Amino acid sequence: KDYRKKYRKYVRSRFQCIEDLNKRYTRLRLIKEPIKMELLFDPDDEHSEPVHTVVFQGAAGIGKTILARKMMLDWASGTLYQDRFDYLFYIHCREVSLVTQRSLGDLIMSCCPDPNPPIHKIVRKPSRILFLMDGFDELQGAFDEHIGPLCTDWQKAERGDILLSSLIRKKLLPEASLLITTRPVALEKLQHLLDHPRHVEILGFSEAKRKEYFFKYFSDEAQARAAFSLIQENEVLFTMCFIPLVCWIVCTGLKQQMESSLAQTSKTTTAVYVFFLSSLLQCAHLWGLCSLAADGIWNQKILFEESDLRNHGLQKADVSAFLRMNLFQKEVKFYSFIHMTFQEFFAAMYYLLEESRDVTVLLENYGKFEKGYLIFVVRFLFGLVNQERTSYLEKKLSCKISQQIRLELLKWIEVKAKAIQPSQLELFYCLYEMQEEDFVQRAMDYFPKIEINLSTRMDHMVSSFCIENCHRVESL
Ligand SMILES: CC(C)(O)c1ncc([S@](N)(=O)=NC(=O)Nc2c3c(cc4c2CCC4)CCC3)s1
Ligand SMILES: Nc1ncnc2c1ncn2[C@@H]1O[C@H](COP(=O)(O)OP(=O)(O)O)[C@@H](O)[C@H]1O
Missing domain, CATH: 3.40.50.300 (P-loop containing nucleotide triphosphate hydrolases)
Known part of the structure; x- marks a missing residue:
C-alpha cells in the first residue's frame, strides 16, 4: 500500500x-x-x-x-x-x-x-x-x-x-x-x-498518424507541411513511414536540409539510412564504429561500457559527439546505438570497408536467434554492395570486397531459392535493397515458383518490384 x-x-x-x-x-x-x-x-x-x-x-x-x-x-x-x-x-x-x-x-x-x-x-x-x-x-x-x-x-x-x-x-x-x-x-x-x-x-502508424507525427516533430507548421508533402510525393518514403523509426529518421534528415530546398529521392531502406548518416557528416571513426557494431553483433553485446568503446578507438569527445548526433544512446554507464538497425547497418559496413570479415561464416549464422537473426546485416549488405549507388560514406568502401560479396550473395540466394530461415518475401526485401536489375533478374530466375504472403503495402511494393524483374529468358 x-x-x-x-x-x-x-x-x-x-x-x-x-x-x-x-x-x-x-x-x-x-x-x-x-x-x-x-x-x-x-x-x-x-x-x-x-x-x-x-x-x-x-x-x-x-x-x-x-x-x-x-x-x-x-x-x-x-x-x-x-x-x-x-x-x-x-x-x-x-x-x-x-x-x-x-x-x-x-x-x-x-x-x-x-x-x-x-x-x-x-x-x-x-x-x-x-x-x-x-x-x-x-x-x-x-x-x-x-x-x-x-x-x-x-x-x-x-x-x-x-x-x-x-x-x-x-x-x-x-x-x-x-x-x-x-x-x-x-x-x-x-x-x-x-x-x-x-x-x-x-x-x-496509419496514414493519418504519419501526418500527425510530422506535424508533432516540426514545431513550425510550414516546415511540417513541406516535409509531409515530400513524403506524399515519394511512394517509397510514404509507404515506409508506417514504421515510426523511419518517420524519425526521415524527419531528422529533412531538418538538416531545412537548416541548409527539400528533396529526398531514397528508394531503399539502405538509401534512407545512408541519407540519414550523410546528414551527420561535417566519419573519422568509421572503422571503429563498424568494428564495434560487428563485435557487438557476433559476440552479443548491445550495451557497451566506456571500456568497450575505448577498445575500438572512441575517445571522450568522440562518444559525446556521437551522443549529440543521435548515433549513440545513453542507457541506465552503458551506451548503445540509437537503434539496433543502426548497429546492424554498421556491422554490414564492416564487411565492405577498405583500409572486413568472412561473409560465408556470417551467412551460415543467418536466421539464428543466438546472433540476433542478422536480418538487417544481410539486407544492408545487398543495399551497400549495389555499385549503381554511391555517396561520400560509400566511397570509403572497397569495390574489390563488394564485388566478391556480390557474388557470394547471389550464390546464397540460389541455395535458399532452390531448396524456412529466410522466407521468399524476406529474399524479396533483400533483392529490393539490391535494386540493380542484372543481379535482381539473375536472382529471380532461381525461384521455381512465387510463393508469398503479403500483409502490408510495403510487402506489395517490394514483391511487386521483384516480380516485375522476373521475366523468363525465352518470354515474348
Ligand atoms: C519480412 C519479414 C516478415 O521477414 C519481416 N517482418 C518484419 C521484420 S523485422 N526485421 O523484425 N522488422 C523489419 O523488417 N523492419 C523494417 C525496418 C525498416 C524498413 C522496413 C521494415 C519492414 C518493412 C520495411 C527500417 C527500420 C526497420 S522481418
Ligand atoms: N508511438 C510513437 N510515437 C512517436 N515516436 C515513436 C513511436 N513509436 C516509436 N517511435 C520512434 O521510433 C523509435 C524506435 O521505436 P522503438 O519502440 O524503440 O522500436 P522497436 O522497439 O519496435 O524496435 C523511437 O526511438 C522513436 O523515435
Whole structure:
C-alpha cells in the first residue's frame, strides 16, 4: 500500500521520456489475431477467466519499446489497469543476462528504486503483477527451447534462460500476467513456450498518424507541411513511414536540409539510412564504429561500457559527439546505438570497408536467434554492395570486397531459392535493397515458383518490384 505508492512515484519519474516528454507519442495501430489497451487482459468468452499472457509482435522500429514505456507511464499515473495491477515490472530484455544466475526475486528487486524492497510483500499477490518483457528478440545469446529443469520457486537462483523460460511458461508465479513484445522473426522461438497467449500485432502508424507525427516533430507548421508533402510525393518514403523509426529518421534528415530546398529521392531502406548518416557528416571513426557494431553483433553485446568503446578507438569527445548526433544512446554507464538497425547497418559496413570479415561464416549464422537473426546485416549488405549507388560514406568502401560479396550473395540466394530461415518475401526485401536489375533478374530466375504472403503495402511494393524483374529468358 505505502510501498505501491513509492514504487508508482518512481515509475512515473523514470518513464517520463522516450529517451530514458511523452507528448511526441503518436497513437500506434494495434490489432488482435482496434484493440483497447485497458481491455487487453479481459476474457472474450473464457467463462470469466482472464488472459495471463499477451504477445505484441511488431517489426523492428515499429514502436514496441515506446508502447511498453507508455504502458508503464499510464499505469503509474492511474490511467491504465488501475484496479487490475498493483505492480508493473519492466524487464528490459537487452539488459538481462541469459547465463548469470538470479532468482525472480532478484529480477523484481532490480526494477525497484531502493536497495531493500519488500519483495515478500510484493509477491504475496502474484495475480496483481504484470511483467512487461520488452524486446524478447533482444535477449543476448542463445535462448534454447530444450532448457531445464523448469523452476517453480521465485526465491531460487537460476540461469537467466531457465528463469525467463520458467516465467514465460507460467511455472514461476503461474497467475501473474505477462506482456511480451517481440519482432515477428523471434515468434517462432517464443510460440513453443507460450501458454494460451492473446496475440496482438503492432501495425505502426496509419496514414493519418504519419501526418500527425510530422506535424508533432516540426514545431513550425510550414516546415511540417513541406516535409509531409515530400513524403506524399515519394511512394517509397510514404509507404515506409508506417514504421515510426523511419518517420524519425526521415524527419531528422529533412531538418538538416531545412537548416541548409527539400528533396529526398531514397528508394531503399539502405538509401534512407545512408541519407540519414550523410546528414551527420561535417566519419573519422568509421572503422571503429563498424568494428564495434560487428563485435557487438557476433559476440552479443548491445550495451557497451566506456571500456568497450575505448577498445575500438572512441575517445571522450568522440562518444559525446556521437551522443549529440543521435548515433549513440545513453542507457541506465552503458551506451548503445540509437537503434539496433543502426548497429546492424554498421556491422554490414564492416564487411565492405577498405583500409572486413568472412561473409560465408556470417551467412551460415543467418536466421539464428543466438546472433540476433542478422536480418538487417544481410539486407544492408545487398543495399551497400549495389555499385549503381554511391555517396561520400560509400566511397570509403572497397569495390574489390563488394564485388566478391556480390557474388557470394547471389550464390546464397540460389541455395535458399532452390531448396524456412529466410522466407521468399524476406529474399524479396533483400533483392529490393539490391535494386540493380542484372543481379535482381539473375536472382529471380532461381525461384521455381512465387510463393508469398503479403500483409502490408510495403510487402506489395517490394514483391511487386521483384516480380516485375522476373521475366523468363525465352518470354515474348
Ligand atoms: C519480412 C519479414 C516478415 O521477414 C519481416 N517482418 C518484419 C521484420 S523485422 N526485421 O523484425 N522488422 C523489419 O523488417 N523492419 C523494417 C525496418 C525498416 C524498413 C522496413 C521494415 C519492414 C518493412 C520495411 C527500417 C527500420 C526497420 S522481418
Ligand atoms: N508511438 C510513437 N510515437 C512517436 N515516436 C515513436 C513511436 N513509436 C516509436 N517511435 C520512434 O521510433 C523509435 C524506435 O521505436 P522503438 O519502440 O524503440 O522500436 P522497436 O522497439 O519496435 O524496435 C523511437 O526511438 C522513436 O523515435
